[PDB]
Structure 1
Amino acid sequence: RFLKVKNWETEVVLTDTLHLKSTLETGCTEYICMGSIMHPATKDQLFPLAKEFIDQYYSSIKRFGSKAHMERLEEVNKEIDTTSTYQLKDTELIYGAKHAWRNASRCVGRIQWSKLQVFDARDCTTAHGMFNYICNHVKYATNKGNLRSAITIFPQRTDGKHDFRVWNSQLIRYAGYKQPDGSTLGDPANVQFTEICIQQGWKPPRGRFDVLPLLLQANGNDPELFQIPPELVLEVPIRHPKFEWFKDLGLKWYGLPAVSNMLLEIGGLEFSACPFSGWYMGTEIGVRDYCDNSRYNILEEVAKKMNLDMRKTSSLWKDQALVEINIAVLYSFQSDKVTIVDHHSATESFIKHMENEYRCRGGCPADWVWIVPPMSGSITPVFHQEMLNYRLTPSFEYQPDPWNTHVW
């Protein structure tokens, strides 16, 4: 059936037909909704997946049922027969990577989806090769602060014993240190990964903003440590446009957000190493990174310097410090001409993207739980936007952390 979505602020109603093309599961049933749960091959399994993807690629370039389409189908059939897998054409890899982003229901940045620079790294064989490819990615995507979206695609999975993996969760992240007296120096989300890097020989500077090394696994071998050359790592000192004391907090962040632990699935092929990057929405730094209780957890210090009354929650001192921290982040990036988007502009772009996708595509899968920003929700337009969530492929998927599967 067709399905309608209503925006309760504008009363606009859209009609979804695209959900009829989905086949992966959501996790919900008719009786239980799992919308706030974070995470709910063979020759036989492969060809229908390959066929569907080839079909939708040739349907996208409007040569469905063409000789090129027919020949590709047979070419893929023979290749799965004689090798239990197949290799994408370059054109298909690019189309598949752009559409995995287009289909990412949790991403508010998707208005940019067709401006994605796709780096083909399928000829890589070693961790040194991966490091080279990744340095080139970081340099290209950073672009002296004028950030450019990019993805680098390493060889696909074969037997599951020869996986390519970036062990880092992001290419650029700060270390976290388990202090003797109990607390945490640096970034507490990375304590385990930091300790794995130390355990592999990394000499930790034990600062607050230590860029972690890359830990890279090629063809299922043990992973190897590499230091990203510092001139490739663009950072922003965080200051406030009114509180001159804000800089004395000693805060900084990196400009390049680059997810490196997800899995890219295209036509039944699995790309276990596919680091991809864009640019930040300011709340990603200022709300979650800085203010989660299990993260940098700085709200108390900021509220202190603002001299806010912190004895009762109903003074909303936490909410006041939260806004100022996010003003500082946005101000700092813009002052340094590092690409960044505020949650008001981003959500506005996403509503416009939604309208575009409903018109030209018949829908847009979207995860309200993730699309609504972690602060000032209902004063952004996505709060009032009903969204249908469903799984379209090509897609990005979660995968296990490699230190739970790897045999040394």
Structure 2
Amino acid sequence: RFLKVKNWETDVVLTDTLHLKSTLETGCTEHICMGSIMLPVRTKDQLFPLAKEFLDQYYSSIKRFGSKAHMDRLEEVNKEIESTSTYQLKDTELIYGAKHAWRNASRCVGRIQWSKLQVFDARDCTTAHGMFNYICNHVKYATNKGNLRSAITIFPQRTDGKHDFRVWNSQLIRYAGYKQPDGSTLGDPANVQFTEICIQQGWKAPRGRFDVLPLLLQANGNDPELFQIPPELVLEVPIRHPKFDWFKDLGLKWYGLPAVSNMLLEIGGLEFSACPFSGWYMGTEIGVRDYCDNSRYNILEEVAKKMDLDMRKTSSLWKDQALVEINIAVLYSFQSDKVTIVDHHSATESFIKHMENEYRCRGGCPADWVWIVPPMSGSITPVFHQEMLNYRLTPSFEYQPDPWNTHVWK
């Protein structure tokens, strides 16, 4: 088979063959497309085949397929699975797996950096305090004083599903959200529920607008525990505008390190329920979504008012106008504090190059157009005019139920 993909701005056409290897489902039938849908204990028998194909890829990637080292590793793994039911990955395999989970993330526009990933092996970790230490070292290393470095910390793989390691926070660093009895929300609305669990667990909220939440860490299936990330480790950027000297008075700021912590990493059948990973922000994530979504900080009106814009009628495009300035401010601020960050133009342009490269070296690049195209100025970024094929490849990062909706408390 062969599937063609065309870019309507360059007339460039690409041939995808990589999709042939996709085994997982898409949520789409032949009679329906669910492309815009947000979220559409393995047994030993189910496990070996998964390990095999994975190990086949690995060895193939190091140009040693069929070798003796390859066969013996298969024999070694098969045996281990039969006797122990599970199986431990080699350090080289773990690093290969993680980079590929990233490499296969169809919703990630920053994959051009996929091979530059620092992997921290936290498989010997046994307690929550242990997880805390590991996370602090990840935050410090990745931040690097503003010169951000991609990194991922991998805790023990799931066993019987009763001794899972979970990082309850959705991101290592995030601002608390509090619901007021008057119905309004102070802080970040998106984190209200998690904030409550933290308070309910003993956290003492400063009840402010940008309070870095504490970590809630679950080790070996035990009840989660609270820890406060060392402030001197949480790099933040106050947001000011290059021309609007009143912007700083808006009292805005954001953290510099985006580190996802609620996803599950799958490598050769194994499941790593705790695998926080971080990179660096694309401006629009903060400028458009975090600040302007109606269900987030929702700063449009206040930014507009101060800009003195005709807010009487939408057709004046006051919302659009204010959005640009706000995103202007985010990029400017980060660049001024020498904290890594990329704008949607550069990010989407690099992604197009990475995508083409991937087609010519792997035979494809699974991509989710709904997620790749930026939440602003969509059509003036190259990805918009790019047809994409979305399919599933492992290793991979997946979502998992929120830990508070499944955890069996002790």
Same fold (TM over 0.5): yes
Aligned mates of 1:19, 1:182 — CA distance in 2:
48
Deviations along 1:303-341, whole A, 9 cap, x unmatched? 000000111111110000100000000000000000000
Aligned mates of 2:124, 2:176 — CA distance in 1:
31
Aligned mates of 2:396, 2:408 — CA distance in 1:
28
Deviations along 1:171-207, whole A, 9 cap, x unmatched? 0000001112110000000000000000000000011
Match of 1:282 in 2: 283
1:407 Cα shift?
A: 1.3
Name stretches of at least 5 consecutive residues in structure 1 with no aligned partner: none
Aligned mates of 1:315, 1:161 — CA distance in 2:
56
Aligned mates of 1:387, 1:407 — CA distance in 2:
41
Aligned mates of 2:125, 2:48 — CA distance in 1:
25
1:37 Cα shift?
A: 0.6
Deviations along 1:88-110, whole A, 9 cap, x unmatched? 00000000000000000000000
1:30 Cα shift?
A: 0.7
Q: Secondary structure of the residue that 1:5 maps to in structure 2?
A: strand
Q: Secondary structure of the residue that 1:280 maps to in structure 2?
A: coil
1:252 Cα shift?
A: 0.3
Aligned mates of 1:60, 1:254 — CA distance in 2:
37
Deviations along 1:265-319, whole A, 9 cap, x unmatched? 0000000000000000000001000010110001000000000011111111000
Deviations along 1:93-129, whole A, 9 cap, x unmatched? 0000000000000000000000000000000000000
1:382 Cα shift?
A: 0.2
1:374 Cα shift?
A: 0.2
1:249 Cα shift?
A: 0.3
Q: What is the CA RMSD across the aligned residues, in angstroms?
A: 0.4
Deviations along 1:348-399, whole A, 9 cap, x unmatched? 0000000110111100000000000000000000000000000000000000
1:39 Cα shift?
A: 1.0
Aligned mates of 1:397, 1:45 — CA distance in 2:
18
1:155 Cα shift?
A: 0.2
Deviations along 1:193-243, whole A, 9 cap, x unmatched? 000000000000011000000000001100000000000000000000000
Matches within 5 A, 1:310-389: 310-389=311-390
Match of 2:83 in 1: 82
Q: Secondary structure of the residue that 1:270 maps to in structure 2?
A: strand
User: Structure 1: which 4+ aligned runs deviate by more than 3 Å?
Assistant: none
Tell me the percent identity.
97
Deviations along 1:12-65, whole A, 9 cap, x unmatched? 001001000110000101110111111114100000000000000000001000
Aligned mates of 1:64, 1:270 — CA distance in 2:
24
Aligned mates of 2:260, 2:155 — CA distance in 1:
14
Aligned mates of 1:334, 1:29 — CA distance in 2:
45
Aligned mates of 1:224, 1:29 — CA distance in 2:
43
Match of 1:27 in 2: 27
Name stretches of at least 5 consecutive residues in structure 2 with no aligned partner: none
Match of 2:204 in 1: 203
1:67 Cα shift?
A: 0.2
Q: Secondary structure of the residue that 1:325 maps to in structure 2?
A: helix
TM-score normalized by the length of structure 2: 0.99
Q: Secondary structure of the residue that 1:300 maps to in structure 2?
A: helix
Aligned mates of 2:229, 2:353 — CA distance in 1:
37
